Structure 1
Amino acid sequence: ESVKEFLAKAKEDFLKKWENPAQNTAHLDQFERIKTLGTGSFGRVMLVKHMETGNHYAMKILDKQKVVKLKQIEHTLNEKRILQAVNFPFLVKLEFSFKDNSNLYMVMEYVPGGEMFSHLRRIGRFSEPHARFYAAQIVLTFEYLHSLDLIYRDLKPENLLIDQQGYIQVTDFGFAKRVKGRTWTLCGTPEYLAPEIILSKGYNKAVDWWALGVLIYEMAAGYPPFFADQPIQIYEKIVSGKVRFPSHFSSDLKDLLRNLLQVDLTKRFGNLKNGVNDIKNHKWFATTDWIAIYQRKVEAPFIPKFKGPGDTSNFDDYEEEEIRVSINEKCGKEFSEF
């Protein structure tokens, strides 16, 4: 019940920032471009150095015109408004946000450790205790987000960074949305999509718990529960209602996954009467000290190699591209509140 006490205070803090979001807290010329850490349809993330403090940050640059073409205006506004309002040990903090004639900018704490994806693929798979450590942090993070009426909708190793302490840092709130009712947007990542999303149904926060099942599976197995060469083939497997576990999977783990990867919403863990407690009290988490996890007092199974505050060895290489700023303002009305 001390959790309710914590969540109560947490919601008070969130709501004040949610209703009065911070805007224009920095300028581009206050940062030094160093290296591109990632790129996508929109947009790109770069390692930057804040001259005033000497601190290194991860700066995402979004081309406003490209955001409009992809019809991601509202989603982008969601992301920024939510990020500036949230506060949790396993969520990357948004330090600054601003915009110019051409681009939108979000400056967050840099995590040299790299993505879980990279470490998972290289090592092959995590031991159950190793996967349990990460899973526990996601469980607490979702408990926090959901209590604020927030749905995440993009859980995957690619969006999970490993800090110097070996703990998880959740990134990419591109599809994050505050909603109390049901929602309908087709979004996420194929391997992690819940059946109700694929079937174009009205869904809720239960999709995040399904994604957790996929994450835990992939961490412990080394591969997703549903994989193929094409997304369409993946969707067929997801809606089939069948799943196969590796022989090394423990009985407790398989039981937990059958409850998370449950097509029936009236039976899926995290969406029942007991809520998240059905997960936190499961046998697979019997050895998990939730308070110790939150307080970061638990010893991490893996610590990334540190080579400096601005080291990028733990990240792959990407093609560098100019940061062009038009002389004319683009999409002014669309991103007025950003």
Structure 2
Amino acid sequence: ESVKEFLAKAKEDFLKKWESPAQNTAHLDQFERIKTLGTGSFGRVMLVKHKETGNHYAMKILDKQKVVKLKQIEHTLNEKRILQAVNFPFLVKLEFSFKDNSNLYMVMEYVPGGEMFSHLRRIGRFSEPHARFYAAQIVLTFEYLHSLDLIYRDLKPENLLIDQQGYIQVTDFGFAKRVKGRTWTLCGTPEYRAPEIILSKGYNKAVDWWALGVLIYEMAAGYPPFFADQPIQIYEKIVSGKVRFPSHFSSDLKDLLRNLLQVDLTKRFGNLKNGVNDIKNHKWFATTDWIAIYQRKVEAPFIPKFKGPGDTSNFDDYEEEEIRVSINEKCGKEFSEF
């Protein structure tokens, strides 16, 4: 299979799933709720055990009222819809979704090696070969997504999970949208937010390649290229365009980053005629066997400790919160088609 054939075949499967979504229904009382795995601006994700099978999953729980207040209605509908329709080795899989009077639930595959974030912060930084390994998966993953005219828009270590073989699983499709032309929503974790987004311009898939630049930088540096006290000041720095690199960055890494962290869309790698191939062929990815990575035949730079099926020792502890369900339906209209 050539990539053209693989992706055109991928587009055909996706469109079918898109047009006739499967019946992935379940009910809350079917799962035993173990422990909170992580939290974000919108949702709480819990380790759960299916009372029947004994299988573990990660259940994302969203409060309808909160989703409405934070204005994530269209985003949350996108999230579930895109998740159940995509299929790629490094996208977390959606197993069930459903809702009750109060909440929306997305029950995913449980990725048990914790966030990339927590490993990155603890180790301090990733060697360039280590960063390169994760970076290659994101590249292949954006290739897949962008061929489907999907943009991801929230790339960060907090949204990337390490599996049992030490590979990346992209989770949180909260900002994922099908965009064939342009889109306008001011969204995306601040440090990773593309300039064109901040400038309130219409933007496209190219914002993800900016975000890839920020990721790769943070992975090798141990800190992101643009940071400050308040999100305002950060945006100033992102728009300024001036990036400074640490002295230990190889010369290739510096060059790739210069071409990803390009404020001018006409120059940004992944947005040129050659497209994604400008990244795949850049000096820094010379030793990358792009196919072998897709087939997961390459040895991961490390593999997290495992101590059982429902072991959560790779995740931080979070304060456990009661899961409340109203006796009457709430936001019946806003989430009618969930």
Q: Into which bin does the TM-score normalised by the smaller protein fall?
A: over 0.9
Alignment of structure 1 residues 98-137 onto 2, 5 Å: 98-137=98-137
2:293 aligns with 293
2:237 aligns with 237
Deviation at 1:325, TM superposition (A): 1.2
Q: Distance in 2 between matches of 1:64 and 1:8?
A: 36
Q: Distance in 1 between matches of 2:240 and 2:43?
A: 34
1:160 aligns with 160
- Contact 1:24/1:99, CA 8 A, preserved across alignment: no
User: Could you list the per-position Cα deviations for residues 182-235 of structure 1 after superposition, in whole angstroms to 9, with x for gaps in the alignment?
Assistant: 111000011111111111111100000000000000000101011111111111
Deviation at 1:42, TM superposition (A): 2.1
* Aligned CA distance change for structure 1 residues 24 and 290 (closer, same or farther; 3 Å): closer
Deviation at 1:22, TM superposition (A): 3.0
Q: Distance in 2 between matches of 1:30 and 1:296?
A: 33
- Contact 2:218/2:225, CA 8 A, preserved across alignment: yes
* Aligned CA distance change for structure 1 residues 12 and 254 (closer, same or farther; 3 Å): same
Q: Which residues of structure 2 form unaligned runs of 5+?
A: none
1:283 aligns with 283
Alignment partner of 1:327: what SS?
Answer: coil
- Contact 1:23/1:98, CA 8 A, preserved across alignment: no
Q: Distance in 1 between matches of 2:84 and 2:103?
A: 18
Deviation at 1:285, TM superposition (A): 0.4
- Contact 2:24/2:95, CA 8 A, preserved across alignment: no
Alignment of structure 1 residues 152-191 onto 2, 5 Å: 152-191=152-191
Q: Distance in 2 between matches of 1:7 and 1:104?
A: 31
Say how many residue pairs are matched. 338
User: Could you list the per-position Cα deviations for residues 30-75 of structure 1 after superposition, in whole angstroms to 9, with x for gaps in the alignment?
Assistant: 1001101122342211100012211110001111111111111000
Deviation at 1:13, TM superposition (A): 0.6
Q: Distance in 2 between matches of 1:53 and 1:271?
A: 46
Q: Distance in 1 between matches of 2:94 and 2:123?
A: 30
More deviation, 322-331/84-93: 322-331
Deviation at 1:326, TM superposition (A): 1.1
Q: Distance in 1 between matches of 2:256 and 2:24?
A: 45
Q: Distance in 2 between matches of 1:23 and 1:43?
A: 23
Q: Distance in 2 between matches of 1:84 and 1:179?
A: 17
Alignment partner of 1:84: what SS?
Answer: helix
Alignment partner of 2:85: what SS?
Answer: coil
Alignment partner of 1:188: what SS?
Answer: coil
- Contact 1:213/1:257, CA 8 A, preserved across alignment: yes
Q: Distance in 2 between matches of 1:301 and 1:98?
A: 37
1:24 aligns with 24
Q: Distance in 2 between matches of 1:199 and 1:335?
A: 31
Q: Distance in 1 between matches of 2:179 and 2:277?
A: 22
User: Could you list the per-position Cα deviations for residues 158-191 of structure 1 after superposition, in whole angstroms to 9, with x for gaps in the alignment?
Assistant: 0000001000000000000001011110000111
- Contact 1:90/1:137, CA 8 A, preserved across alignment: yes
TM-score using structure 1 length: 0.98
Residue 314 (structure 2) pairs with residue 320 (structure 1): no
Alignment partner of 1:58: what SS?
Answer: strand
Q: Distance in 1 between matches of 2:254 and 2:221?
A: 11
Residue 311 (structure 2) pairs with residue 311 (structure 1): yes
Alignment partner of 1:38: what SS?
Answer: strand
Alignment partner of 2:326: what SS?
Answer: coil
- Contact 1:149/1:180, CA 8 A, preserved across alignment: yes
Deviation at 1:99, TM superposition (A): 0.6
TM-score using structure 2 length: 0.98
Q: Which residues of structure 1 form unaligned runs of 5+?
A: none
User: Could you list the per-position Cα deviations for residues 114-134 of structure 1 after superposition, in whole angstroms to 9, with x for gaps in the alignment?
Assistant: 000000000000000000000
Q: Distance in 1 between matches of 2:261 and 2:306?
A: 36
Deviation at 1:23, TM superposition (A): 4.5
Alignment partner of 1:322: what SS?
Answer: coil
- Contact 1:37/1:317, CA 8 A, preserved across alignment: yes
- Contact 2:154/2:175, CA 8 A, preserved across alignment: yes
Instruction: Compute the RMSD of aligned alpha carbons.
Output: 0.9
Q: Distance in 2 between matches of 1:199 and 1:34?
A: 43
Q: Distance in 2 between matches of 1:205 and 1:42?
A: 23
User: Could you list the per-position Cα deviations for residues 66-92 of structure 1 after superposition, in whole angstroms to 9, with x for gaps in the alignment?
Assistant: 111111100000000000000000010
Aligned-residue sequence identity (percent) comes to 99
Deviation at 1:327, TM superposition (A): 1.3
- Contact 1:137/1:168, CA 8 A, preserved across alignment: yes
User: Could you list the per-position Cα deviations for residues 92-126 of structure 1 after superposition, in whole angstroms to 9, with x for gaps in the alignment?
Assistant: 00000101111111000111100000000000000
